[PDB]
Structures are given as structure tokens and as C-alpha cells.
């Protein structure tokens, strides 16, 4: 099958300027026979271009297309606020008809540090057997963040699930929640619970941690 | 023009499923139709493809044997079939017309295959230099969704309601938290409520510092 290679994967860039997208494919593609959709969360995708250069129904003029052969780009030359989304290219030549991984184009905006927020579990939960312990790393950017679970002063793997927003409305952050489960019986074997954050706004990581119990 | 998909599903492995898609406003029996997978967090992923004139498919090698594309003209409806589903077959189910490029899309089917049974959620506060956070975990549920709001929805500004992660048991789990200021945590209410229609549970809870 004909593979298609999306890059970058994430564009950062400012409202008002053009964002290129690249799609490269694996074996040549007849006839410009390749597609561009764009996806926003929580909803289908859509066409915006067709035939590596015509535009769908309704697609603005901002949005184009060109290429031919392995390489294709898309073109959107005046980011307005409805355009930070994910975009999929696809060629529709060979059965099967791939999709390439997706390009996002995310809102650029200042470093920011997240603030760092850890929550003990709660005398309600502990009460039915289980302990969830919960950092948030709130409205931060870029998105490269990392957090680190630490019991006792040893580090935690296997037992933490994490989660992240989509990009802020109001000011282009992102926030994360990190999720560390333990039964009660193991919770109450440890002391020292703490998160470790490491992000490019923060001179050194940040620890935010409390004693069980105390 | 449009293509209607049918309503979400819940499923346990082994079990068979068809979902539907049915298109009004052109003629269904001269355009193909087809089917794209999308797990959540992930890329769209082509099945296949049909012809409904004559049902002349065309399958991904990923799919083909897994489900059957199938198509109703006196109906005007396209279906996609499994056999035995997988629980890696959890994930949303678009229909679309084919040119052989997806100009015209349904709204989804949401697809989710599990041996868990329907159950509601537990609602735990996460209890509170010049910025106090809060918030609640709701944790323990199944299917998808919950909705959660804060203060019967007078409270947004701050408010992050995080996506839901799959557990290893099996239930899913999320938490909504908000920032405040500090000096409020003596003097405001912050009540998170939760409902989680397929159990028909409603959950309000006080978090306090
Ligand atoms: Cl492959
Ligand atoms: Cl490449
Ligand atoms: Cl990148
Ligand atoms: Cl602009
Ligand atoms: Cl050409
Ligand atoms: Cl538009
Ligand atoms: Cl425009
Ligand atoms: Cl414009
Ligand atoms: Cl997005
Ligand atoms: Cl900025
Ligand atoms: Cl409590
Ligand atoms: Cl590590
Ligand atoms: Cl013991
Ligand atoms: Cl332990
Ligand atoms: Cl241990
Ligand atoms: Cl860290
Ligand atoms: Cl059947
Ligand atoms: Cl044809
Ligand atoms: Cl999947
Ligand atoms: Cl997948
Ligand atoms: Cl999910
Ligand atoms: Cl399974
Ligand atoms: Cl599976
Ligand atoms: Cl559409
Ligand atoms: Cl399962
Ligand atoms: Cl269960
Ligand atoms: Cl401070
Ligand atoms: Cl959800
Ligand atoms: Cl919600
Ligand atoms: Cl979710
Ligand atoms: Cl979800
Ligand atoms: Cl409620
Ligand atoms: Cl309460
Ligand atoms: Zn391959
Ligand atoms: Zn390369
Ligand atoms: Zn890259
Ligand atoms: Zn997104
Ligand atoms: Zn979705
Ligand atoms: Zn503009
Ligand atoms: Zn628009
Ligand atoms: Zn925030
Ligand atoms: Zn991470
Ligand atoms: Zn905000
Ligand atoms: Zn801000
Ligand atoms: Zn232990
Ligand atoms: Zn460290
Ligand atoms: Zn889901
Ligand atoms: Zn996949
Ligand atoms: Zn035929
Ligand atoms: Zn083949
Ligand atoms: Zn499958
Ligand atoms: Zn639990
Ligand atoms: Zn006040
Ligand atoms: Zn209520």
C-alpha cells in the first residue's frame, strides 16, 4: 500500500500567517489524486481539497492545494482562530485508499510554567479501599511537560494515567492531569507522596508533595 | 444531502453488530460509499469502500475479513458489519460518500466493546500563592459519557474537565477541575455535578477545603 508521511506533525504558528502542510507519499500518486481533510475535536472530518488542488464546496479562499507525484502540500495563508485543528491528506489512487497521520496546527503564543497543584485521595474513597492521588499542571505552554511520581522517594511506573486539554481558548495553554492509583493496603505502606514537574518555563523542576496522614 | 448513522453502541467480545448509514438527497446507487475507524486519540484509518449499484467493495487488507460493507439501495442505506468484535474494535465509525475522495460525511457512530457492565460513576472531591485549584474525580464508570458541570454551570472561567482515560479494570475515569482565588475558599460553594446517562445517575457534590 501506498504510505503517506505527514510532517511536521505540530505547527505552532500566530493567527493571520500561512501554515504549510506537508504529505509525501511512498509511491507516486496517479492523476493528483490526493485529498486534504481537516478535523476539529468532537467532530467528523471535512473535505477541503480534492484533486491535490481544487477547492471543495464552500472552502474559503485561504485554504489551497498543490503537488503532484510524492510530494504534496496544503496551504492555509491566513490562520484565523477556527483553523487550529488537525489535518489529514489521503490518496484515493490505489486500494487502499491511506490517510497519512495528521499535521496540528497549534496556536504559538510565550513560554509559560505550569503551576503545579497535588491533591491527596479522599477520606471518601479511602474509606471503599482504593487511594487516587492527582497532580494538575495547569495552563502551560509549550505542550512538552514531564511529570514524575515519587512514593517514598522512589520513582513510579505502571501505576499513573495521564490527560491533556486541548489548547485554551482565552490564552493558548495547555493543562494536564496525572492519576496515581494504589489499594488502600499499599497506599498506607508509604509516607511520602510526591509529583515532579519539569517544563522549559521552569528554571528547575518543581515538587509538590505531602506527608500521608500528616 | 445527508447521511445518517446510527445511534452509539455497547457491546461484549464475541458479539455481532451492523451499524447503518442512510443517505437522502442524491442517488445513492451511482456514487460510492464507504467507511473510515478512528480510536480515540488516534488518525483516521480507511475500511473500505462500495458501490451500492451492483456492491462491487473494496476493502482495506487491515479490515477484510473482520467486517463486511454492505449496501440496501431500495433503502438508500450503506452498513458495515463484524461478525465477532474485538475489543479493539472500540472507536468511532464515520460513513461517507466516496468520489473516490470523502466528500460528504455522517456524523459518526461511537462503537464501544467491552466486558464491562453499565455502571455509574463515584464522585470524590479533590479538596483546595494567590490561586487555590479544586476539583472533583469521577472515577469508576462505563460506557462513555459523563457530563460534568460546576455550580449548575455558573462557574466556567478556569474550568478544565479532562478527557476520560480507559482503566485497567476496565472502567473509565476523569477528573474537572477549576482554578479560584484563595480568598473565595471561605466564602464561595464549588459543587461539581455530574450525570452519566446510561445509569441514570445524577451526583452533586461540595468540595471544601
Ligand atoms: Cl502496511
Ligand atoms: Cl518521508
Ligand atoms: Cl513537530
Ligand atoms: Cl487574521
Ligand atoms: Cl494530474
Ligand atoms: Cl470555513
Ligand atoms: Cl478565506
Ligand atoms: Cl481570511
Ligand atoms: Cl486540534
Ligand atoms: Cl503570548
Ligand atoms: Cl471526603
Ligand atoms: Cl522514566
Ligand atoms: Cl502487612
Ligand atoms: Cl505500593
Ligand atoms: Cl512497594
Ligand atoms: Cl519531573
Ligand atoms: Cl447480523
Ligand atoms: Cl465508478
Ligand atoms: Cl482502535
Ligand atoms: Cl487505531
Ligand atoms: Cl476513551
Ligand atoms: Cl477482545
Ligand atoms: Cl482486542
Ligand atoms: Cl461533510
Ligand atoms: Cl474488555
Ligand atoms: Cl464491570
Ligand atoms: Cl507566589
Ligand atoms: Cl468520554
Ligand atoms: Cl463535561
Ligand atoms: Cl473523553
Ligand atoms: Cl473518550
Ligand atoms: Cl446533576
Ligand atoms: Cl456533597
Ligand atoms: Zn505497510
Ligand atoms: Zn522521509
Ligand atoms: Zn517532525
Ligand atoms: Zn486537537
Ligand atoms: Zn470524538
Ligand atoms: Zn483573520
Ligand atoms: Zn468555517
Ligand atoms: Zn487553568
Ligand atoms: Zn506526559
Ligand atoms: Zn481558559
Ligand atoms: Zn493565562
Ligand atoms: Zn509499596
Ligand atoms: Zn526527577
Ligand atoms: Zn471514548
Ligand atoms: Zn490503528
Ligand atoms: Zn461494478
Ligand atoms: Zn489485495
Ligand atoms: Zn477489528
Ligand atoms: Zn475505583
Ligand atoms: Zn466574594
Ligand atoms: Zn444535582
Known amino acids: 500500500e501506498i504510505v503517506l508521511t505527514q510532517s511536521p506533525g505540530t505547527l505552532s504558528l500566530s493567527p493571520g500567517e500561512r501554515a504549510t502542510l506537508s504529505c509525501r507519499a511512498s509511491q507516486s500518486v496517479s492523476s493528483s489524486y490526493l485529498a486534504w481533510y481537516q478535523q476539529k475535536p468532537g467532530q467528523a472530518p471535512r473535505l477541503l481539497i480534492y484533486?491535490?488542488?481544487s477547492r471543495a464546496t464552500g472552502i474559503p479562499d485561504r485554504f489551497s492545494g498543490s503537488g503532484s507525484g510524492t510530494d504534496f502540500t496544503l496551504t492555509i495563508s491566513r490562520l484565523e482562530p477556527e483553523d487550529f485543528a488537525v489535518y489529514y491528506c489521503?490518496?484515493?489512487?490505489?486500494?487502499?485508499?491511506?490517510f497519512g497521520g495528521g499535521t496540528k496546527v497549534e496556536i504559538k503564543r510565550t513560554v509559560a510554567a505550569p503551576s503545579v497543584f497535588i491533591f491527596p485521595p479522599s477520606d471518601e474513597q479511602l474509606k471503599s479501599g482504593t487511594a487516587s492521588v492527582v497532580c494538575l499542571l495547569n495552563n502551560f505552554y509549550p505542550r512538552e511537560a514531564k511529570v514524575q511520581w515519587k512514593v517514598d522517594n522512589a520513582l513510579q511506573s505502571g501505576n499513573s494515567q495521564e490527560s491533556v486539554t486541548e489548547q485554551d481558548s482565552k490564552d493558548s495553554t495547555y493543562s494536564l492531569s496525572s492519576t496515581l492509583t494504589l489499594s488502600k493496603a499499599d497506599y498506607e505502606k508509604h509516607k511520602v507522596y510526591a509529583c515532579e514537574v519539569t517544563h522549559q518555563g521552569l528554571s528547575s523542576p518543581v515538587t509538590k508533595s505531602f506527608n500521608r496522614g500528616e | 444531502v445527508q447521511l445518517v448513522q446510527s445511534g452509539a453502541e455497547v457491546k461484549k467480545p464475541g458479539e455481532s453488530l451492523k451499524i447503518s448509514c442512510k443517505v437522502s438527497g442524491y442517488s445513492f446507487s451511482t456514487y460510492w460509499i464507504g467507511w473510515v475507524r478512528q480510536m480515540p486519540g488516534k488518525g483516521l484509518e480507511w475500511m473500505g469502500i462500495i458501490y451500492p449499484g451492483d456492491s462491487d467493495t473494496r476493502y482495506s487488507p487491515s479490515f477484510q475479513g473482520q467486517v463486511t460493507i454492505s449496501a440496501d439501495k431500495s433503502i438508500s442505506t450503506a452498513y458495515l458489519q463484524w461478525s465477532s468484535l474485538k475489543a479493539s474494535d472500540t472507536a468511532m465509525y464515520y460513513c461517507?460518500?466516496?468520489?473516490?475522495?470523502?466528500?460528504?460525511w455522517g456524523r459518526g457512530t461511537l462503537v464501544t466493546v467491552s466486558s464491562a457492565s453499565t455502571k455509574g460513576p463515584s464522585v470524590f472531591p479533590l479538596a483546595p500563592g494567590g490561586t487555590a485549584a479544586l476539583g472533583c474525580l469521577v472515577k469508576d464508570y462505563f460506557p462513555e459519557p459523563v457530563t460534568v458541570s460546576w455550580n449548575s454551570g455558573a462557574l466556567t472561567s478556569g474550568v478544565h474537565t479532562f478527557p476520560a482515560v480507559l482503566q485497567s479494570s476496565g472502567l473509565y475515569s476523569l477528573s474537572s477541575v477549576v482554578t479560584v482565588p484563595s480568598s473565595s475558599l471561605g466564602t464561595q460553594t464549588y459543587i461539581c455535578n455530574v450525570n452519566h446517562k446510561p445509569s441514570n445517575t445524577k451526583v452533586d457534590k461540595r468540595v471544601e477545603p
Open positions: 484533486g491535490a488542488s
Open positions: 461517507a460518500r466516496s468520489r473516490w475522495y470523502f466528500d460528504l
Open positions: 489521503q490518496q484515493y489512487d490505489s486500494s487502499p485508499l491511506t
